[PDB]
Paper text:
Although the ligand-free cryoEM structures of HPM7 spike reveal a 3 RBD-down conformation, our data suggest that the antibody is capable of shifting the equilibrium by capturing RBD in the up conformation.
The protective mechanisms for the coronavirus disease 2019 (COVID-19) vaccines are still being deduced, however, several analyses have found that the elicitation of neutralizing antibodies (nAbs) correlates with protection (Feng et al., 2021; McMahan et al., 2021), a finding consistent with many other successful antiviral vaccines. nAbs have been identified that target several distinct epitopes on the S trimer, but the majority of nAbs target the receptor binding domain (RBD) (Barnes et al., 2020; Piccoli et al., 2020).
Numbering used by the authors:
A (entry chain A), B (entry chain B): 740 to 788
C (entry chain B): 838 to 887
D (entry chain A): 937 to 1034
E (entry chain B): 986 to 1034
F (entry chain A): 14 to 247, 254 to 296
G (entry chain C): 297 to 618, 632 to 676, 689 to 690
H (entry chain A): 543 to 618, 632 to 676, 689 to 690
I (entry chain A): 346 to 394
The structure:
Amino acid sequence: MYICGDSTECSNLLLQYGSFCTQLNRALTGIAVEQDKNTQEVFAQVKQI
Amino acid sequence: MYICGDSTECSNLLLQYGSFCTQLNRALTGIAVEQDKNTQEVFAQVKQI
Amino acid sequence: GDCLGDIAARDLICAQKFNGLTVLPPLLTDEMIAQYTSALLAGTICSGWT
Amino acid sequence: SLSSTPSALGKLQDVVNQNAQALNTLVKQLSSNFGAISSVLNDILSRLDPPEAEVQIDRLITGRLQSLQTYVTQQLIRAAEIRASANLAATKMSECVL
Amino acid sequence: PPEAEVQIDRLITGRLQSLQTYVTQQLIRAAEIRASANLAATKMSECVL
Amino acid sequence: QCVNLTTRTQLPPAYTNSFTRGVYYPDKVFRSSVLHSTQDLFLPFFSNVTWFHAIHVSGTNGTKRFDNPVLPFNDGVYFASTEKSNIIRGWIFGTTLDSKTQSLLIVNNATNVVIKVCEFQFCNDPFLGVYYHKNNKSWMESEFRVYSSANNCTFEYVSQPFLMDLEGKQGNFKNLREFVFKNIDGYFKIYSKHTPINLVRDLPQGFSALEPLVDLPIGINITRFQTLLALHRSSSSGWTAGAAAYYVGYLQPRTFLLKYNENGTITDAVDCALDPL
Amino acid sequence: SETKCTLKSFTVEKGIYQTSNFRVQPTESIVRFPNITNLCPFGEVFNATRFASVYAWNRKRISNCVADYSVLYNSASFSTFKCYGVSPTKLNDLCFTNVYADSFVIRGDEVRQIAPGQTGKIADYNYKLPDDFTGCVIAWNSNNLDSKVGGNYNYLYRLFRKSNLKPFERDISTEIYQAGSTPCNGVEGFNCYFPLQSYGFQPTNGVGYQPYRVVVLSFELLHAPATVCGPKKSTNLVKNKCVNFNFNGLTGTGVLTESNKKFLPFQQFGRDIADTTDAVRDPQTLEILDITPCSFGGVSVITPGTNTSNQVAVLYQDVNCTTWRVYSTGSNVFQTRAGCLIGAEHVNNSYECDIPIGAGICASYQTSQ
Amino acid sequence: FNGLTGTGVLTESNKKFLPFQQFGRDIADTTDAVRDPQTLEILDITPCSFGGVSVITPGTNTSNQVAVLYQDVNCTTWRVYSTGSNVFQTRAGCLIGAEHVNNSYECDIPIGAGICASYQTSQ
Amino acid sequence: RFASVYAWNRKRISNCVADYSVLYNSASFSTFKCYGVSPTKLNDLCFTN
Ligand SMILES: *[C@@H]1O[C@H](CO)[C@@H](O[C@@H]2O[C@H](CO)[C@@H](O)[C@H](O)[C@H]2NC(C)=O)[C@H](O)[C@H]1NC(C)=O
Ligand SMILES: *[C@@H]1O[C@H](CO)[C@@H](O)[C@H](O)[C@H]1NC(C)=O
Ligand SMILES: *[C@@H]1O[C@H](CO)[C@@H](O)[C@H](O)[C@H]1NC(C)=O
Ligand SMILES: *[C@@H]1O[C@H](CO)[C@@H](O)[C@H](O)[C@H]1NC(C)=O
Ligand SMILES: *[C@@H]1O[C@H](CO)[C@@H](O)[C@H](O)[C@H]1NC(C)=O
Ligand SMILES: *[C@@H]1O[C@H](CO)[C@@H](O)[C@H](O)[C@H]1NC(C)=O
Ligand SMILES: *[C@@H]1O[C@H](CO)[C@@H](O)[C@H](O)[C@H]1NC(C)=O
Ligand SMILES: *[C@@H]1O[C@H](CO)[C@@H](O)[C@H](O)[C@H]1NC(C)=O
Ligand SMILES: *[C@@H]1O[C@H](CO)[C@@H](O)[C@H](O)[C@H]1NC(C)=O
Ligand SMILES: *[C@@H]1O[C@H](CO)[C@@H](O)[C@H](O)[C@H]1NC(C)=O
Ligand SMILES: *[C@@H]1O[C@H](CO)[C@@H](O)[C@H](O)[C@H]1NC(C)=O
Ligand SMILES: *[C@@H]1O[C@H](CO)[C@@H](O)[C@H](O)[C@H]1NC(C)=O
């Protein structure tokens, strides 16, 4: 959507770089998981409420 | 000056995507501020002389 | 005017400035840092951790 | 003190503001031509045939991928800073609170 | 003009890439310095004071 | 045919402050609630504007001045005027401004607007004029000079007819008219706006953006231009100036940050080269 | 399957994967052009009795017509046809705004000079195109129309000049050129020249010396109201549906709605912050329409390992179920703050988290599982 | 110079070119010297623009006065936009428009090298 | 006389002004193509071999 939003012709060219897009998302996913981990590490010290 | 120093013709072309220069400068400014902050945290712990 | 005098010297500092690269001064000078260090030592010797 | 000193929570407000700016920057960067005749794919496609359009489009694709890569890199660096802060906070929770 | 513009744009893209590379390296290095500064500040409080 | 006007007093030129004026919509695209950066030729902010005027004051040591000089066109011209009686009628654009080259004549003659491009031979003191008839209190066109000849006429346009008010009105200037003139790739580009005013000296401080008016497919070289004023008649000495003033500035390439409001009107701007702030 | 393709695997591990965005395909097409009925003056431009001399070329405005150039196929033959603006195959899908036709006669060898970036007598002293040129150049042999047995000396060109022309200028002055130190007040000889020369066009001339008729069509595209459009039939206007469209040559895909925007009289298109068209003025009814993209987003898939089960649940982040831009339902619709989750069974027991979803909600694969 | 264009300041050079050399080059591969086509002497070329400028601003929601710092200017014809008044030389550059007060205070807007600034008193 | 193509003639040109406009008064070329420079820039240049 960022690069070839709703454009078939652009999308077909973009496929050459599909492995590039995959890596961009893997990096962002790793961050996202980490952010929930950080919250749990700081607050959930004791599991007895 | 780094990319197109002293040249009108390439300057006008550079403006086409000059928003990238602003982003670079913001990153370097952020570092510059941080470096003075680091100095103060290490040495200026006591404000009494 | 100094960089014109230094053309023969080929000073890297001028080359960097002419290409748009600069260096900013620190906010605290070496003298100011020395004063903080001296205050910390004076404090420690006189009153320890208090 | 907290009520009367708005700057007190700047450390948390800054996180919010930086993330908003990073995304607003990516949207604004879409307007760049990156060497192309036009930043709008529809303009390129309406006026040029396939082999000419492909050249102009490829210039835009490369530039757009570069913008996203820049974004991701900045987010990774910021994530590291936050991780360090979170680790410190966790340490304090154990050593100051518990 | 139109021929120069092609050659110039090639140089601009490359020149911009070099500056972006520089900034990225400075940001990473700055983080390492920050960690050192935090350690130094910790030592100032715990070893000196 | 042509008349060389006389009795005019010689005075030094006046200068005024352009403030923040001369901005025009640089595009044909609707934008709203945004800021936008543009690099076209604009009047720089707070620039030197030459102030010209037409006036008849009194007898004895009266000012008796009527400014209609040939001015450089340079890279484009910001032109503005303040008036109450339709004295400024039009302009001559060209190089030599004689029979050797093509020149562009744009004139409102109180019947219609006529645009021509011809190898015109112009008068040294081109003017138009209105005779005041005490009998039946009428103001009517009586004279047209401007040129002694025209030849090949490669471009021509005539507007639909209208009646123009020629009354020798008294009071403060009521009408501010602004124009921007550019000559690009053969086109003579005009931008304009009409603003109601109430004033007695120089350009008011304020801000407005001018709209595109016309792209004329002219094809000629312009280096100089002249402003055409109308005279009031009761030979070369038998005339009364009436009251009007006009301002001329020059455009330069500049970068501006323009601000659009919620309805797409440009309401403000920053001249990025004015100062460090 | 989208997850499997993304991961390049025929096996997917337990967890949540993002799977693109919810997308909408267009179902109808809209074509809108001003309702122009006149055919363009092809006859006047290409069938003129006489063409201008190159030193004093003609220029004509073209407006309020249909550019159906197929009309020239039966009788015209062009040796040269080159478009600088657009690809030739797109000419019939476009609208043009400030359209002008420049017209003149030159020699065959000089045809190559009617192009951006060229030098030579014509390019420097008689007729010049800008380096940045939008338009098409057309030329053809006119030996049987313009050449005469004793020589057709009616066509003139400028040979002497002091400086070069700028794009689209017409210098028609006949003043004597000074080549030497002599002032050339008159004189018309020695080092003083009459600047214009004739072309002796004869039927016996070789090809490079035969006359050619040149027509240059100069125009701007897609940034202003159209005055001239190609031969394309319009359709009805369809609102609040995902459609393909063409408004005066500007194509795109989206959903059209009524707008409250007020365009100035000379504005045809509007643009957003990313310089993408987001509004148009309809060419037949002057109504401003806004354009919104059809697709929007937020889809992710909750997967038990595929080596255990083929059941999945799909989360729609921006859907408030409480057919809502959803691929399928089949009940099991649970609204959460993280989106509308479809396919999972909601239970009221709290459990330790296995596959996190968001906003306090977590999923597992449990009991007939 | 023989078709090679540019902008800069031309000065006499101490470089001695071999008989067949026409132009010199820097590490950046830019031109930094030429042989003059008519006078057989060598000139060095230095860019006209040197740099170093920043602006000290009180918020614009308070006032529009600013002070300008020129990092590479020594004010002791100064390559400044305006000499103005209140010209204060600091180790961080020549600062024009700020008053110099010998009373120290807590830092507000940092300038550098021990100097800070603030807006205060007719402020 | 021009040379046979199999045995083409090479002539050295030096110490002169390349005022090609002198050909406008007589020569007519059907082919003219520059490979290394843009034609419009020729009058501002100097050439060696
Ligand atoms: C537009 O008109 C100007 C003024 O007549 C032309 O500039 C002159 O050119 C001659 C010949 O080179 C010089 O001797 C004069 O000194 C120039 N005068 C000025 C004021 O510059 C200019 O060349 C014309 N433009 C074109 C495209 O021909
Ligand atoms: C105006 O004066 C000039 C001399 O400055 C003269 O050549 C011209 O013929 C005069 N015109 C008229 C109408 O008297
Ligand atoms: C130009 O403007 C300045 C003020 O900035 C003024 O002093 C000067 O008299 C004006 N006119 C001329 C011809 O310089
Ligand atoms: C204005 O010009 C038109 C066209 O040349 C002419 O018919 C008309 O009579 C003129 N009116 C006056 C007052 O000169
Ligand atoms: C006023 O009277 C004069 C003759 O004294 C005549 O020429 C003129 O046309 C009249 N004006 C009008 C409007 O009839
Ligand atoms: C311009 O007018 C003169 C009048 O003597 C005429 O000889 C010449 O041919 C005309 N030029 C054009 C291009 O019509
Ligand atoms: C836009 O126009 C409306 C009237 O339709 C008016 O009430 C509103 O104030 C205008 N907005 C702006 C920013 O001027
Ligand atoms: C030119 O005229 C001939 C008839 O003599 C006709 O067949 C042809 O179609 C015409 N061409 C154009 C462009 O009108
Ligand atoms: C023709 O154009 C007019 C004006 O734009 C419009 O009102 C009318 O509906 C159009 N009609 C058709 C195709 O019937
Ligand atoms: C869905 O819409 C209703 C209002 O009709 C609102 O109360 C509810 O909170 C919305 N659901 C979510 C998850 O925000
Ligand atoms: C001509 O060139 C020589 C160098 O070859 C130089 O010494 C001389 O001064 C030049 N002279 C002119 C234009 O008189
Ligand atoms: C400025 O020049 C003077 C000599 O005139 C020197 O003593 C001073 O240290 C220089 N200032 C700085 C900041 O280097």
